[PDB]
Amino acid sequence: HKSEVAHRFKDLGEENFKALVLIAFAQYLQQCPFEDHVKLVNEVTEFAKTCVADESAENCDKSLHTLFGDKLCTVATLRETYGEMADCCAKQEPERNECFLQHKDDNPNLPRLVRPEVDVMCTAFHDNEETFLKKYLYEIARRHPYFYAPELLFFAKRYKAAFTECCQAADKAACLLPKLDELRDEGKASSAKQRLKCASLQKFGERAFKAWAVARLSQRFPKAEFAEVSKLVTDLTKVHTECCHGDLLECADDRADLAKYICENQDSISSKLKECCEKPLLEKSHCIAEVENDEMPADLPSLAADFVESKDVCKNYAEAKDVFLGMFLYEYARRHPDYSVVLLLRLAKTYETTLEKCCAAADPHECYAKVFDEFKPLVEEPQNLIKQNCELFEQLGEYKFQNALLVRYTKKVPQVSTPTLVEVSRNLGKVGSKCCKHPEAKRMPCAEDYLSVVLNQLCVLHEKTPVSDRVTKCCTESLVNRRPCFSALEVDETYVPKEFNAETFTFHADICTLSEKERQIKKQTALVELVKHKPKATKEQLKAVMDDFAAFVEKCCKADDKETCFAEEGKKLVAASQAALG
Ligand SMILES: CCCCCCCCCCCCCC(=O)O
Ligand SMILES: CCCCCCCCCCCCCC(=O)O
Numbered sequence: 194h195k196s197e198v199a200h201r202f203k204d205l206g207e208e209n210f211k212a213l214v215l216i217a218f219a220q221y222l223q224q225c226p227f228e229d230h231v232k233l234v235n236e237v238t239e240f241a242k243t244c245v246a247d248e249s250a251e252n253c254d255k256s257l258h259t260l261f262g263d264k265l266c267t268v269a270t271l272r273e274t275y276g277e278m279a280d281c282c283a284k285q286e287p288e289r290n291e292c293f294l295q296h297k298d299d300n301p302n303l304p305r306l307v308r309p310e311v312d313v314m315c316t317a318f319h320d321n322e323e324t325f326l327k328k329y330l331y332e333i334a335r336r337h338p339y340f341y342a343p344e345l346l347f348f349a350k351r352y353k354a355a356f357t358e359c360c361q362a363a364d365k366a367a368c369l370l371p372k373l374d375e376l377r378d379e380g381k382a383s384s385a386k387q388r389l390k391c392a393s394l395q396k397f398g399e400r401a402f403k404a405w406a407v408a409r410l411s412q413r414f415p416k417a418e419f420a421e422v423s424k425l426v427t428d429l430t431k432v433h434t435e436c437c438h439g440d441l442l443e444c445a446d447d448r449a450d451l452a453k454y455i456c457e458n459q460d461s462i463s464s465k466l467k468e469c470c471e472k473p474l475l476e477k478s479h480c481i482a483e484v485e486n487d488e489m490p491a492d493l494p495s496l497a498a499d500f501v502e503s504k505d506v507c508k509n510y511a512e513a514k515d516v517f518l519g520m521f522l523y524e525y526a527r528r529h530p531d532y533s534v535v536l537l538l539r540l541a542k543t544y545e546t547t548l549e550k551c552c553a554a555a556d557p558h559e560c561y562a563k564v565f566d567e568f569k570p571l572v573e574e575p576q577n578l579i580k581q582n583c584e585l586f587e588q589l590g591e592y593k594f595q596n597a598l599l600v601r602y603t604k605k606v607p608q609v610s611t612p613t614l615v616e617v618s619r620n621l622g623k624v625g626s627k628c629c630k631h632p633e634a635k636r637m638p639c640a641e642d643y644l645s646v647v648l649n650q651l652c653v654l655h656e657k658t659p660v661s662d663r664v665t666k667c668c669t670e671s672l673v674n675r676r677p678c679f680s681a682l683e684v685d686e687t688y689v690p691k692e693f694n695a696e697t698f699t700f701h702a703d704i705c706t707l708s709e710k711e712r713q714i715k716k717q718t719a720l721v722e723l724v725k726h727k728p729k730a731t732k733e734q735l736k737a738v739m740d741d742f743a744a745f746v747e748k749c750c751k752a753d754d755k756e757t758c759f760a761e762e763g764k765k766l767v768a769a770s771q772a773a774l775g
């Protein structure tokens with residue numbers, strides 16, 4: 194094209210253009226204030242329009258990288274605020290843009306973002322929607338500089354819908370706060386999932402990434418032929434490699450190209466792609482990535498004939514081992530959309546280990562005749578963990594399920610900090626809540642995705658502040674072994690009970706009318722401290738103390754003099770509990 198800035202402006206339309214430009218500058222210049230960025234965005238937008246009017250006017254024929262970089266090099270506080278990043282300006286393209294990318298900051302040391310009160314939020318949203326929404330977009334972008342700009346834009350539109358719905362409601366806070374909860378968690382997850390894929394590509398390498406993609410794409414597109422899946426695996430891997438190592442525009446072009454190839458070849462790939470493929474360029478790759486699994490073909494045969502029974506198994510394998518294993522993973526995965534991806538990779542690894550043994554043995558065919566039997570323990574372990582945890586979740590409800598996990602995990606790794614124990618147990622409880630309301634066939638994939646983000650959060654915290662060799666092992670294992678390493682953790686027989694501290698077990702009158710979350714967290718914090726203090730306490734003894742706690746809170750929140758109730762009845766409860774637990 195004559196003018197890439199005009200091309201993009203036309204493809205995107207003014208409103209998306211401006212939003213994306215704001216995210217771009219915020220991701221590179223994480224410390225500049227909102228108003229400074231609004232001025233850069235307006236100036237870039239004004240310039241873009243001249244190019245749309247006449248693609249031969251001044252500067253309109255420069256690359257986007259050239260234009261973007263030039264604008265960055267005009268910021269007056271560049272050296273003052275970003276130091277060595279100003280020296281990127283002494284370079285030509287493409288080294289200049291390379292240099293700018295090296296200076297982004299994953300952990301920007303910015304203050305926690307405060308959710309204002311619901312009435313303040315709705316008022317700001319009514320009084321100036323544009324500013325309200327753009328400011329939050331800016332705040333999120335500068336805190337997540339690698340997050341894919343278009344997906345950020347997809348969340349922003351969901352925020353807008355939530356304020357539109359809930360600000361005109363009768364009970365604004367009870368409408369909105371659950372929606373904002375849901376969206377913040379989905380956004381945190383998406384951000385963690387992206388970081389995780391990039392780390393894992395570097396740690397475990399490209400072959401392992403392709404294995405993962407074969408499994409994932411085959412579940413999603415089970416009517417596609419292996420040759421088409423293999424094609425998509427190769428293109429997907431290239432896309433991910435660039436998006437991990439790359440600037441926004443290179444990632445965007447790679448994603449747009451794959452989406453277009455997919456949309457042109459729907460008939461070969463999936464029947465569920467028509468809606469997505471109608472959508473505007475901006476949303477297409479995203480929509481595709483989130484499409485539901487196609488229906489698998491009817492009356493597919495058993496894998497036995499090709500992978501066990503044939504005389505030619507070792508020959509077909511040795512001819513090209515990764516193609517054969519890829520084929521095994523394709524056939525297995527498309528027949529089992531109810532499996533986690535990591536389970537399918539365990540099976541593939543098991544199959545490979547068996548062929549490596551058996552193809553060099555005296556009688557290969559006899560040696561690998563029972564390989565499918567080796568799959569059964571692998572499959573049953575996650576299915577049985579889901580049933581047990583979902584049965585417990587149905588008995589207790591979310592909050593008491595969380596409390597069960599708090600007790601469980603605190604005894605297993607009592608050296609972890611209380612906030613971390615509380616946060617991770619709370620999150621695991623929310624994985625239960627989400628995934629146990631799916632039917633059996635959808636639980637294992639759901640669990641896999643969401644556990645992967647909770648366990649990632651834990652491993653991130655633990656790397657920064659190590660306390661347990663056992664957690665370190667789980668965190669540095671292969672991605673396929675990570676969750677079973679955590680499930681295999683046992684009770685810590687070596688922990689020395691924390692000393693009693695009375696202030697830890699004191700509570701105040703405000704407990705009564707505080708937010709549902711805030712009340713829960715205060716109770717769960719004390720539950721963890723109780724288990725840390727009394728790690729040998731039995732289930733019946735903890736139930737008794739927990740029951741007494743609940744009678745104590747019920748009494749004191751109905752009293753007229755609440756501060757004295759909490760202090761006087763609080764001391765009694767503590768002394769009774771200490772006697773019972775010994
Ligand atoms: C205590 C958390 C409750 C979440 C629901 C239970 C999940 C059990 C593990 C599922 C297996 C994840 C995928 C895998 O490792 O194959
Ligand atoms: C503090 C570490 C938390 C570990 C979370 C593992 C996720 C799966 C939870 C299912 C219950 C534990 C599995 C088991 O012990 O068999």
Ligand SMILES: CCCCCCCCCCCCCC(=O)O
Nearest residue numbers: 698716719720739742743770771
């Ligand atoms: C030995 C000192 C123990 C003091 C007793 C405090 C116990 C913590 C209460 C845990 C919350 C229970 C859950 C609930 O009923 O909401």
